Amino acid sequence: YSPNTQQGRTSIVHLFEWRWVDIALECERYLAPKGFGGVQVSPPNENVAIYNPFRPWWERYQPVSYKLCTRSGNEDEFRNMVTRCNNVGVRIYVDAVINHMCGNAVSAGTSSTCGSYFNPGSRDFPAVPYSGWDFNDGKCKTGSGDIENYNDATQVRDCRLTGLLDLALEKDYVRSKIAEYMNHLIDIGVAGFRLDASKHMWPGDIKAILDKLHNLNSNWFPAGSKPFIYQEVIDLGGEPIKSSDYFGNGRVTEFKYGAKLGTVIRKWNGEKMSYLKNWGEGWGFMPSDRALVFVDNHDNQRGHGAGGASILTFWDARLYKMAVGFMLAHPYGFTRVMSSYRWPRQFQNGNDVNDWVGPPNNNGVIKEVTINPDTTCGNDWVCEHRWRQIRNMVIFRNVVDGQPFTNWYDNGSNQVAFGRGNRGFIVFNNDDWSFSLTLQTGLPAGTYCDVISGDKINGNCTGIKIYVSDDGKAHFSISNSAEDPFIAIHAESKL
Ligand SMILES: OC[C@H]1O[C@H](O[C@H]2[C@H](O)[C@@H](O)[C@@H](O[C@H]3[C@H](O)[C@@H](O)[C@@H](O)O[C@@H]3CO)O[C@@H]2CO)[C@H](O)[C@@H](O)[C@@H]1O
Ligand SMILES: OC[C@H]1O[C@H](O[C@H]2[C@H](O)[C@@H](O)[C@@H](O[C@H]3[C@H](O)[C@@H](O)[C@H](O)O[C@@H]3CO)O[C@@H]2CO)[C@H](O)[C@@H](O)[C@@H]1O
Ligand SMILES: *[C@@H]1O[C@H](CO)[C@@H](O)[C@H](O)[C@H]1NC(C)=O
Ligand SMILES: *C(=O)[C@@H]1CCC(=O)N1
Ligand SMILES: [Ca+2]
Ligand SMILES: [Cl-]
């Protein structure tokens, strides 16, 4: 249940589709000094090479083998990355796709990221190796063989998720091949895993696999360190399968978090920020100590999975920064920041027809991540984790770690604020008028640099300055026309 990050580092960043060499560099040049706890990487195992459409991001969720050979790099490059990141105290978490192999309709051949032969039709994946009796063909009871109804908890687990060949996870052989793959990664140095499509695996089968896993590599981690496990389970209610069914294996993705934060910030259906006072379990969310939270993820930022049209992404930059800011300031759950790539989003009848587009590439070869002088990224990588407003809130969370939620204020509409013990305070204005008021901050008297509009550099603030007096009060002014309609100050931004 614990992330295994360095003490004081409270967030992980999803460097979606990034190449291993770029992540290794990012660890040393940015993530380490900026205090990021770790990185969730795209599936490192060999996958189906899909040409129609042209190399979609989702081809990486169709395993061909467990060889660490993908568009992100080979095994040596993967190990190089894990080693370099761990050496600078930044962890690596692997997106483990262990529920299935490729789509059952993919043509047999060597159209895979490493040239491995596979025959979906004959259930043949010799590179593992898996064969017909390693899949759930006979176990599934639907007429299509695919998952047809989420109200039947059994077919959700035993049938094919959108045609993906479903592994017979009850077999010790299959459990062992998966464990062999994950233990290879653990021994290499990975700190944990995102268990892809966990809702599609029986809680008990996952547990059986986890019981085969090693403790983290003792060269970097304390003896007895268990790998961090966060299971992807989309539970927004209305279905028999609940997130809680997986608490015995590790943390679980709380999709209700970003879904509701999106509706609140967009002010849909009369919702407003003042309602966030009891944010957390009060909103029907899972226990904070089991939640892996985020505003958006690789799926719902592009209409895949769940979360709805309410989901906030980098496309909605201004509101997005505020959502990410609220999340990073609030004590609930363990935070994951999304880092994406720009794609030619094209809406037709309310839907993005280019939601399949893969990462920036030159004839299929993923482009490297170029760093600009202003610290942003080129080659179409959005690099949200590098936006000042997000990067400074990542440090905010670290600074206020362990402090209680306190000193909440709200105007009954969309102007709210709250503090984290005597270490940080944040103010939001999502109303269509100015927020100008003196608030109790719970902070020691002094001059504080607002870390949203600026930075504390060389003993001075580059943006807004807040003055806290002896009573802990300070005046805040946020126009609804402000570039970023929120201010955040903390112990380390104090002059
Ligand atoms: O030996 C030739 C044979 O090799 C490969 O077969 C593998 C199976 O695909 C794989 O399932 C596994 O078989 C085990 C069963 O799963 C398990 O229930 C129990 O019966 O033990 C079996 C043996 O360990 O391993 C075999 C052997 O590696 C390949 O996939 C076949 O195509 C090939 O004919
Ligand atoms: O630390 C680097 C810079 O980080 C910040 O720049 C961000 C913006 O804050 C973010 O909104 C986004 O730009 C959008 C912009 O706000 C919006 O008005 C425009 O129309 O669309 C943009 C979407 O791409 O991205 C940049 C980073 O690329 C910070 O504001 C800046 O001062 C820092 O230098
Ligand atoms: C802040 O800026 C002032 C004005 O230039 C400068 O005199 C001062 O030295 C700076 N603060 C620090 C701590 O360097
Ligand atoms: C938590 O993520 C990991 C898996 C469960 C445990 O005890 N540690
Ligand atoms: Ca399954
Ligand atoms: Cl996820």
Sign of the C-alpha dihedral, residues 112, 114, 120, 121? positive
Residue type, 320: Y
How many A from CA of 164 to the centre of ligand 5?
A: 9
Look at ligand 3, atom 11, and give the residue with the nearest C-alpha.
Answer: 459
Please say if 232 is a catalytic residue.
yes
For ligand 3, say whether the CB of 458 is within 6 Å of any of its atoms. yes
Q: Which residues contact 88 (CB under 8 A, 6 or more apart)?
A: 27, 28, 31, 32
**CA atoms lying within 13 Å on the CB side of residue 379:** 13
> Of these residues, 134, 196, 205, 271, which one is catalytic?
196
CA distance 150 to 132: 25
- Phi, psi at residue 218, to the nearest 5°? -65, -5
Which ligand 4 atom lies nearest to the CA of residue 229?
A: 2
How many A from CA of 311 to the centre of ligand 2?
A: 19
Please say if 471 is a catalytic residue.
no
Q: Which residues contact 288 (CB under 8 A, 6 or more apart)?
A: 280, 281, 331, 332, 333
Residue type, 138: G
Nearest to 200 by CA among 246, 252, 161: 161
Cβ(155)–Cβ(54) below 8 Å: no
> What CATH fold (topology level) applies to the domain 403-495?
Immunoglobulin-like (2.60.40)
- Using H for helix, E for strand and C for coil, what is the string for the chain? CCCCCCCCCCEEEEECCCCHHHHHHHHHHHHCCCCCCEEEECCCCCEECCCCCCCCHHHHHCECCCCCCECCECHHHHHHHHHHHHHCCCEEEEEECCCEEEECCCCCECCECCCCCEEHHHCEECCCCECHHHECCCCCCCCCCECCCCCCHHHHHHCEHHHEEEECCCCHHHHHHHHHHHHHHHHHCCCEEEECCHHHCCHHHHHHHHCCCCCCCCCCCCCCCCCEEEECCCCCCCCCCCHHHHCCCCEEECHHHHHHHHHHHCCHHHCCHHHHHHCCHHHCCCCHHHEEECCCCCCHHHCCCCCCCCCCCHHHHHHHHHHHHHHHHCCCCEEEEEECECCCCCEECCEECCCCCCCCEECCEECCCCECCCCCECCCECCHHHCHHHHHHHHHHHHCCCCCEEEEEECCCCEEEEEECCCEEEEEECCCCCEEEEEECCCCCEEEECCCCCCEECCEECCCEEEECCCCEEEEEECCCCCCCEEEEEHHHEC
For ligand 3, say whether the CB of 469 is within 6 Å of any of its atoms. no
CA distance 395 to 34: 7
Query: CA 327, 331, 332, 333: dihedral to nearest 10 degrees?
Result: 90
Provide the residue ranges of all domains of the chain, joining segments of one domain with +: 1-402, 403-495
> Annotated binding site: which residue ranges?
99, 157, 166, 194, 200, 297, 336
Give the pocket of ligand 4 (CB within 6 Å).
Answer: 1, 226, 228-229, 250-251
What residues have a C-beta under 5 A from ligand 5, the ion? Answer: 99, 166, 200
Which ligand 2 atom lies nearest to the CA of residue 314?
A: 23
Burial 60-76 (b: 16+ CB within 10 A, else e): bbbbbbbbbbbbbbbbe
CATH superfamily of 1-402: Glycosidases (3.20.20.80)
Residue type, 4: N
CA distance 316 to 144: 39
Nearest to 423 by CA among 335, 332, 326, 488: 488
Q: Which residues contact 308 (CB under 8 A, 6 or more apart)?
A: 259, 262, 263, 300
At 192, list the tokens: 């944990």
Sheet holding 405-410, edge to edge: 405-410, 415-420, 424-429, 486-490
CA distance 363 to 366: 8
Q: Which residues contact 316 (CB under 8 A, 6 or more apart)?
A: none
Q: Which long-range contacts (CB under 8 A, 24 or more apart) does 469-474 make?
A: 469/445, 470/445, 471/440, 472/440, 472/441, 472/442, 472/443, 472/444, 472/445, 473/438, 473/439, 473/440, 473/441, 474/425, 474/438, 474/439, 474/441, 474/443, 474/448
